Amino acid sequence: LAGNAARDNKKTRIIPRHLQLAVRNDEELNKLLGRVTIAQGGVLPNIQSVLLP
Amino acid sequence: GGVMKPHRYRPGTVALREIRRYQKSTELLIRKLPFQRLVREIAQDFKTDLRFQSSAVMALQEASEAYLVALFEDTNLCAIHAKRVTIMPKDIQLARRIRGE
Amino acid sequence: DNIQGITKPAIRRLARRGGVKRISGLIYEETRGVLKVFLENVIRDAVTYTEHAKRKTVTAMDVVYALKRQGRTLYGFG
Amino acid sequence: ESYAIYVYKVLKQVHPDTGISSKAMSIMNSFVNDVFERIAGEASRLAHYNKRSTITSREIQTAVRLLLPGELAKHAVSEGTKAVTKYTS
Amino acid sequence: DDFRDPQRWKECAKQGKMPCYFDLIEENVYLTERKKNKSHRDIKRMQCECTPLSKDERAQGEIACGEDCLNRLLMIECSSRCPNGDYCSNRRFQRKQHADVEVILTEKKGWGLRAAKDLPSNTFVLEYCGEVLDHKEFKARVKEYARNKNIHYYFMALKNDEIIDATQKGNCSRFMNHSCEPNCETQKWTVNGQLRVGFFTTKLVPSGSELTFDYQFQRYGKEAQKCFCGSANCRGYLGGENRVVYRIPKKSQTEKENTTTER
């Protein structure tokens, strides 16, 4: 999943952001790693629909 | 004859732009030296004349930033449920209460 | 008063990362208090671990164990 | 010592022409350590509840079934069974 | 009426029928540009989140990157790395998709533009292009130019330190006038990391109707100027009110005519 995330951004080296995206963009891995914080990982881009004009 | 300025951004537009800008990136958002000073100050209350590792402080900063980010994420949901755009301390208190803090 | 070092725009930045559009004027102090409490707990545990280890320096592994004890596992500083 | 070289050997089998940073390597090291600790502790509990001296492949399988989600757990059990079968055959 | 031709012609200054006294301009130019910006360190790419089909157009075909794109709502045009590629509609400053404009005389206040055909709201019209000044040159060139007795000053403040001059070189957007009933307005779009100013409509402008935009009022000197629109509440004055010896007798009109006819 990390490699798939990396290829999706035209990169050849897996970075912690890619691990974050791969883990959080999966149904079961997120459940498995719900209480784990990844350094230099960031969050998922999302905006609530009641804030966009 | 004068120099007319074009226009002014509608409010919230640049706020959303910043939201995207800071959600795309992954960096430290807190001033490091102030953070180190704060950690040292609050540690002085448990053992005088301590010494720290750089990584030991980086880990603290990471955990704190993540904790605050999660807290704000829940608080925004709370505010929205309150049918408000602005975020209020009462929302933070409700988030902490329901979460169990 | 080093708690004031956690600047108002810094808190705005954290909120922006969280996905907050408009911030009230009292959010900053409340966040200062919350962060103070959280850091106090974690640091207390870390210094406890250190003093048990007889060390004077506070290792990062101690911070990791403390965060685990709180229930927030951290990957990267192992 | 760590699992770095083993992670590489795994990485090259699922993505030949790619790399991985040291920070990612450490993160994976932590993940391997964490999963190992979880499974081992669960197996140790299970072996205690039945008052048995030995942790067996059955114990590890019980722990895995308890710990992982379903679709993941099923594939995990299949892989482990295949491995333990090949170990003797 | 526009008739853009490269040969200079015999029209002095009004630029109503012969646009080749000054020079036109493409996308603006800079003078002291340095590599100190947010261009390619954090705004490397801001890709919209879209999952299109792009195989069904002209029949059950929705236009790509409409008013539901993450970038259009935030006034950002897509890059070449858009998933829609060459079918994304955000890149309007790069494909030079413009509106039908024409410059003729409407009022003695000056030259302007009138709409050729119908034009809906939120429609791009023209981009403001000119010459980008810097910190030191503005306050010297302005006082060097105020003594030249000119009526129109084509200065627009892009940022707190950037003012764009559209005098020496200007596109078709330099003729638009001011009114207290604006139907068009200006927007600050971000393209390729660089900030650009565009003109958008706000309503259903009929064919043959005026297209002006509201000035953010400003004055620069001791003198004042006044508008001649007077729609319903015209503020009257451009820039508002707030600010931010022997004589050589001149020959009589009769003698001027006589001296003109004797040559």
From Swiss-Prot, chain A:
Positions of transmembrane segments: none
N6-succinyllysine sites (modified residues): 31
Residues with PTM N6-(2-hydroxyisobutyryl)lysine: 10-11, 31
UniProt-annotated location(s): Nucleus; Chromosome
Modified residues (N5-methylglutamine): 40
Lineage top rank: taxon: Eukaryota
Post-translational modification comment from the UniProt entry: Following DNA double-strand breaks (DSBs), it is ubiquitinated through 'Lys-63' linkage of ubiquitin moieties, leading to the recruitment of repair proteins to sites of DNA damage. H2AK119Ub and ionizing radiation-induced 'Lys-63'-linked ubiquitination are distinct events. Glutamine methylation at Gln-40 (H2AQ104me) by FBL is specifically dedicated to polymerase I. It is present at 35S ribosomal DNA locus and impairs binding of the FACT complex.
Modified residues (N6-glutaryllysine): 31
Subunit structure: The nucleosome is a histone octamer containing two molecules each of H2A, H2B, H3 and H4 assembled in one H3-H4 heterotetramer and two H2A-H2B heterodimers. The octamer wraps approximately 147 bp of DNA.
Function: Core component of nucleosome. Nucleosomes wrap and compact DNA into chromatin, limiting DNA accessibility to the cellular machineries which require DNA as a template. Histones thereby play a central role in transcription regulation, DNA repair, DNA replication and chromosomal stability. DNA accessibility is regulated via a complex set of post-translational modifications of histones, also called histone code, and nucleosome remodeling.
Homology family: Belongs to the histone H2A family.
Name the record gives this protein: Histone H2A type 1
Species annotation: Xenopus laevis (African clawed frog)
UniProtKB/Swiss-Prot annotation, chain C:
Compartment(s): Nucleus; Chromosome
Keywords: Acetylation, Chromosome, Citrullination, DNA-binding, Hydroxylation, Isopeptide bond, Methylation, Nucleosome core, Nucleus, Phosphoprotein, Ubl conjugation
N6-lactoyllysine sites (modified residues): 8, 54, 68
Disulfide bonds: none
Glycyl lysine isopeptide (Lys-Gly) (interchain with G-Cter in ubiquitin) crosslink location in chain: 68
N6-(2-hydroxyisobutyryl)lysine: residues bearing it: 8, 21, 36, 54, 56, 68
Modified sites of kind N6-glutaryllysine: 8, 36, 54, 56, 68
Phosphoserine, modified sites: 24
Modified positions (N6-succinyllysine) in chain numbering: 8, 54, 68
Main location, first listed in the record: nucleus
Entry's Gene Ontology molecular function annotations: DNA binding; protein heterodimerization activity; structural constituent of chromatin
Record note on modification: Demethylation is performed by JMJD6.
N6-butyryllysine, modified sites: 8, 21, 54, 56, 68
PTM annotation (N6-acetyllysine): residues: 8, 36, 56, 68
Crosslink (Glycyl lysine isopeptide (Lys-Gly) (interchain with G-Cter in UFM1)) position: 8
CC terms in the record's Gene Ontology section: nucleosome; nucleus
Residues the record lists as N6-propionyllysine modifications: 8, 21, 54, 56, 68
Gene Ontology annotations of biological process type: nucleosome assembly
Record flagged with keyword Transcription: no
Phosphotyrosine: residues carrying this PTM: 28, 65
Subunit structure: The nucleosome is a histone octamer containing two molecules each of H2A, H2B, H3 and H4 assembled in one H3-H4 heterotetramer and two H2A-H2B heterodimers. The octamer wraps approximately 147 bp of DNA.
Function: Core component of nucleosome. Nucleosomes wrap and compact DNA into chromatin, limiting DNA accessibility to the cellular machineries which require DNA as a template. Histones thereby play a central role in transcription regulation, DNA repair, DNA replication and chromosomal stability. DNA accessibility is regulated via a complex set of post-translational modifications of histones, also called histone code, and nucleosome remodeling.
Family as reported in the entry's similarity comment: Belongs to the histone H4 family.
Protein name (database record): Histone H4
Organism field: Xenopus laevis (African clawed frog)
Residues of the full protein shown: 25 to 102 of 103
From Swiss-Prot, chain D:
Principal subcellular localisation of the protein: nucleus
Post-translational modification: Monoubiquitination of Lys-86 by BRE1 gives a specific tag for epigenetic transcriptional activation and is also prerequisite for histone H3 'Lys-4' and 'Lys-79' methylation. GlcNAcylation at Ser-78 promotes monoubiquitination of Lys-86. It fluctuates in response to extracellular glucose, and associates with transcribed genes.
Gene Ontology cellular component annotations, sorted alphabetically: nucleosome; nucleus
Top-level taxon of the source organism: Eukaryota
Subcellular location(s) of the protein: Nucleus; Chromosome
Crosslinked positions (Glycyl lysine isopeptide (Lys-Gly) (interchain with G-Cter in ubiquitin)): 86
A GO molecular function held by the record: structural constituent of chromatin
Name used for this protein in its record: Histone H2B 1.1
Organism from which the protein derives: Xenopus laevis (African clawed frog)
Source taxonomy: Eukaryota, Metazoa, Chordata, Craniata, Vertebrata
From Swiss-Prot, chain E:
Result, substituting residue 203 to Q: In ALL; uncertain significance; somatic mutation
Binding site for Zn(2+) 3: 180, 227, 229, 234
Start and end residues of each Post-SET domain: 223-239
Binding site for Zn(2+) 2: 65, 78, 82, 88
Disease: Renal cell carcinoma: Renal cell carcinoma is a heterogeneous group of sporadic or hereditary carcinoma derived from cells of the proximal renal tubular epithelium. It is subclassified into clear cell renal carcinoma (non-papillary carcinoma), papillary renal cell carcinoma, chromophobe renal cell carcinoma, collecting duct carcinoma with medullary carcinoma of the kidney, and unclassified renal cell carcinoma. Clear cell renal cell carcinoma is the most common subtype.
Compartment annotation: Nucleus; Chromosome
Whole sequence portion shown: 1452 to 2040 of 2564
PTM summary: May be automethylated.
Protein family per UniProt: Belongs to the class V-like SAM-binding methyltransferase superfamily. Histone-lysine methyltransferase family. SET2 subfamily.
Residues binding Zn(2+) 1: 48, 50, 65, 69
Subunit structure: Specifically interacts with hyperphosphorylated C-terminal domain (CTD) of RNA polymerase II large subunit (POLR2A): binds to CTD heptad repeats doubly phosphorylated on 'Ser-2' and 'Ser-5' of each heptad. Interacts with HTT. Interacts with IWS1. Interacts with p53/TP53; leading to regulate p53/TP53 target genes. Component of a complex with HNRNPL. Interacts with TUBA1A; the interaction is independent on alpha-tubulin acetylation on 'Lys-40'. Interacts with STAT1.
All residue ranges annotated as the SET domain in the record: 99-216
Signal peptide: none
Region (Interaction with TUBA1A): 1-244
